[PDB]
Design an enzyme around this catalytic site. Sequence first.
Site, PDB file in Angstrom:
ATOM      1  N   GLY A   1       8.716   0.198   0.970  1.00 26.89           N
ATOM      2  CA  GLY A   1       7.399   0.846   1.101  1.00 26.89           C
ATOM      3  C   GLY A   1       6.653   0.297   2.299  1.00 26.89           C
ATOM      4  O   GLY A   1       7.172  -0.496   3.081  1.00 26.89           O
TER       5      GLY A   1
ATOM      6  N   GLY B   1       2.600  -3.655   7.880  1.00 28.96           N
ATOM      7  CA  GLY B   1       4.029  -3.567   8.211  1.00 28.96           C
ATOM      8  C   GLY B   1       4.816  -2.928   7.069  1.00 28.96           C
ATOM      9  O   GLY B   1       4.312  -2.755   5.958  1.00 28.96           O
TER      10      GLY B   1
ATOM     11  N   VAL C   1       7.927  -2.963   4.348  1.00 28.31           N
ATOM     12  CA  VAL C   1       8.640  -3.978   3.553  1.00 28.31           C
ATOM     13  C   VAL C   1      10.048  -3.474   3.229  1.00 28.31           C
ATOM     14  O   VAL C   1      10.227  -2.320   2.769  1.00 28.31           O
ATOM     15  CB  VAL C   1       7.880  -4.274   2.258  1.00 28.31           C
ATOM     16  CG1 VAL C   1       8.537  -5.412   1.473  1.00 28.31           C
ATOM     17  CG2 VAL C   1       6.413  -4.605   2.566  1.00 28.31           C
TER      18      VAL C   1
ATOM     19  N   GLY D   1       3.652  -1.880   3.454  1.00 25.21           N
ATOM     20  CA  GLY D   1       2.666  -2.926   3.171  1.00 25.21           C
ATOM     21  C   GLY D   1       1.406  -2.670   3.978  1.00 25.21           C
ATOM     22  O   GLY D   1       1.283  -1.636   4.699  1.00 25.21           O
ATOM     23  N   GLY D   2       0.452  -3.579   3.878  1.00 27.64           N
ATOM     24  CA  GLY D   2      -0.803  -3.404   4.582  1.00 27.64           C
ATOM     25  C   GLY D   2      -0.749  -3.430   6.101  1.00 27.64           C
ATOM     26  O   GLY D   2      -1.582  -2.826   6.771  1.00 27.64           O
TER      27      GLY D   2
ATOM     28  N   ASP E   1      -9.490  -6.970   0.058  1.00 28.52           N
ATOM     29  CA  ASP E   1      -8.696  -5.745  -0.078  1.00 28.52           C
ATOM     30  C   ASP E   1      -8.070  -5.573  -1.437  1.00 28.52           C
ATOM     31  O   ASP E   1      -6.887  -5.218  -1.580  1.00 28.52           O
ATOM     32  CB  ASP E   1      -7.680  -5.654   1.031  1.00 28.52           C
ATOM     33  CG  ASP E   1      -7.207  -4.213   1.303  1.00 28.52           C
ATOM     34  OD1 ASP E   1      -7.868  -3.252   0.871  1.00 28.52           O
ATOM     35  OD2 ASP E   1      -6.191  -4.095   2.012  1.00 28.52           O
TER      36      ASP E   1
ATOM     37  N   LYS F   1       8.752  -8.369   4.762  1.00 25.63           N
ATOM     38  CA  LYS F   1       7.756  -7.584   5.479  1.00 25.63           C
ATOM     39  C   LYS F   1       7.872  -7.818   6.978  1.00 25.63           C
ATOM     40  O   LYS F   1       7.725  -8.945   7.461  1.00 25.63           O
ATOM     41  CB  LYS F   1       6.368  -7.945   4.981  1.00 25.63           C
ATOM     42  CG  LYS F   1       5.266  -7.126   5.645  1.00 25.63           C
ATOM     43  CD  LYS F   1       3.940  -7.278   4.936  1.00 25.63           C
ATOM     44  CE  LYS F   1       2.925  -6.271   5.465  1.00 25.63           C
ATOM     45  NZ  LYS F   1       1.729  -6.316   4.609  1.00 25.63           N
TER      46      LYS F   1
HETATM   47  C1  FE7 Z   1       0.920  -6.764  -1.715  1.00 23.24           C
HETATM   48  C2  FE7 Z   1       1.476  -5.367  -1.593  1.00 23.24           C
HETATM   49  S1  FE7 Z   1       2.496  -5.325  -0.158  1.00 23.24           S
HETATM   50  O1  FE7 Z   1       1.702  -5.468   1.021  1.00 23.24           O
HETATM   51  O2  FE7 Z   1       3.441  -4.258  -0.244  1.00 23.24           O
HETATM   52  N1  FE7 Z   1       3.266  -6.732  -0.384  1.00 23.24           N
HETATM   53  C3  FE7 Z   1       4.527  -7.006  -0.988  1.00 23.24           C
HETATM   54  C4  FE7 Z   1       4.899  -8.341  -1.110  1.00 23.24           C
HETATM   55  C5  FE7 Z   1       6.027  -8.697  -1.827  1.00 23.24           C
HETATM   56  C6  FE7 Z   1       6.800  -7.698  -2.392  1.00 23.24           C
HETATM   57  C7  FE7 Z   1       6.484  -6.337  -2.230  1.00 23.24           C
HETATM   58  C8  FE7 Z   1       5.333  -5.998  -1.519  1.00 23.24           C
HETATM   59  C9  FE7 Z   1       7.500  -5.577  -2.941  1.00 23.24           C
HETATM   60  C10 FE7 Z   1       7.679  -4.226  -3.143  1.00 23.24           C
HETATM   61  N2  FE7 Z   1       8.617  -3.835  -4.016  1.00 23.24           N
HETATM   62  C11 FE7 Z   1       9.129  -2.580  -4.416  1.00 23.24           C
HETATM   63  C12 FE7 Z   1       8.711  -1.390  -3.838  1.00 23.24           C
HETATM   64  C13 FE7 Z   1       9.210  -0.183  -4.293  1.00 23.24           C
HETATM   65  C14 FE7 Z   1      10.129  -0.134  -5.330  1.00 23.24           C
HETATM   66  C15 FE7 Z   1      10.683   1.184  -5.813  1.00 23.24           C
HETATM   67  N3  FE7 Z   1      11.957   1.546  -5.177  1.00 23.24           N
HETATM   68  C16 FE7 Z   1      12.526   2.750  -5.784  1.00 23.24           C
HETATM   69  C17 FE7 Z   1      13.883   3.074  -5.204  1.00 23.24           C
HETATM   70  C18 FE7 Z   1      13.809   3.232  -3.700  1.00 23.24           C
HETATM   71  C19 FE7 Z   1      13.108   2.047  -3.066  1.00 23.24           C
HETATM   72  C20 FE7 Z   1      11.784   1.777  -3.741  1.00 23.24           C
HETATM   73  C21 FE7 Z   1      10.536  -1.326  -5.904  1.00 23.24           C
HETATM   74  C22 FE7 Z   1      10.049  -2.539  -5.454  1.00 23.24           C
HETATM   75  C23 FE7 Z   1       6.804  -3.223  -2.509  1.00 23.24           C
HETATM   76  C24 FE7 Z   1       6.819  -3.046  -1.131  1.00 23.24           C
HETATM   77  C25 FE7 Z   1       5.943  -2.163  -0.529  1.00 23.24           C
HETATM   78  C26 FE7 Z   1       5.048  -1.446  -1.290  1.00 23.24           C
HETATM   79  C27 FE7 Z   1       5.029  -1.608  -2.658  1.00 23.24           C
HETATM   80  C28 FE7 Z   1       5.903  -2.488  -3.268  1.00 23.24           C
HETATM   81  C29 FE7 Z   1       8.405  -6.590  -3.541  1.00 23.24           C
HETATM   82  O3  FE7 Z   1       9.398  -6.385  -4.230  1.00 23.24           O
HETATM   83  N4  FE7 Z   1       7.934  -7.805  -3.177  1.00 23.24           N
HETATM   84 MG    MG Z   2      -4.798  -4.848   3.227  1.00 21.67          MG
END
Ligand code: FE7
Ligand code: MG
Length: 295
Positions: free
Chosen positions: A23, A28, A30, A25-26, A140, A45
Amino acid sequence: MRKFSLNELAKVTSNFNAENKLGEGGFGSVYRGFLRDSDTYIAVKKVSRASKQGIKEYASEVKIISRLRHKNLVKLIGWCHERGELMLVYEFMANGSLDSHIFKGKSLLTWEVRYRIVKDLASALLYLHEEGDHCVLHRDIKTSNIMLDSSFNAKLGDFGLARLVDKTLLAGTVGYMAPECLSSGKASKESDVYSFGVVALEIASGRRSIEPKFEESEALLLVPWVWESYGNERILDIADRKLGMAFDPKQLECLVMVGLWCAHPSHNLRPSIRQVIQVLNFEAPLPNLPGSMPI
Ligand SMILES: CCS(=O)(=O)Nc1ccc2c(c1)/C(=C(/Nc1ccc(CN3CCCCC3)cc1)c1ccccc1)C(=O)N2
Ligand SMILES: [Mg+2]
């Protein structure tokens, strides 16, 4: 935590292959990284250098997150600052971020899990505001910054805008920003509590602050509709439709009234996070709120 080289991060993410993107992140994207030697996954990230704010948010994140250890806060497990490239490494959390469950239907969060999540977030905030060598203002707070573990325990992350207390650029996420942010620019414990209020109401209602998707109402935003509902003794109407009748009414009332109190337009009428926790645990009285939202 530890120092990662660019090469090992490239290797474990397959050169940040799009198939490994988890996904945005804020500041960048990840990526899921696979550690062959451990048989484990991490989350990497990769910081965006597309504005100058990328490096500022990386620097803020490393500085602040290094000072924090709490069950309801995300932990940094490594960093990389090598050639031009800046990167941050965390535990992989298979349940992802809270927004994916409450708004996007990744799963239906039970009432009991939601109330626990709000208490988890409140615990994080208490630690930030009151338990460190310096107060940390997050700046945030929102559901995309709340990560869920295997048991659906909540961890607050994203410290790219966070600041230690002892002049900042006005920044934040539209829909979570207290009114005095835009009028004065001043971040405070009370501005963080405002964002918490909004989040509490999103969790109760399953509706996003900025896009609540009302079918029978003209309101464009969550908080005014919740406040109007409360003043018309319609708290039950607030609850996420998806829950049907499987929720605790006493806890729902409490969550809604705490949310509005926290989201008060006037910063001087908002509670401390410690007072919020007392009310959520029924150790102190419900706030006395006016039936109409103040103008
Ligand atoms: C503080 C928020 S942030 O800035 O993003 N920081 C951050 C910090 C540590 C993290 C994650 C995010 C994270 C995510 N996991 C994650 C993301 C998606 C999925 C779901 N599948 C479904 C199948 C295809 C790929 C995504 C599973 C785990 C994630 C990433 C981006 C958006 C949201 C979550 C994770 O495992 N450890
Ligand atoms: Mg932010």
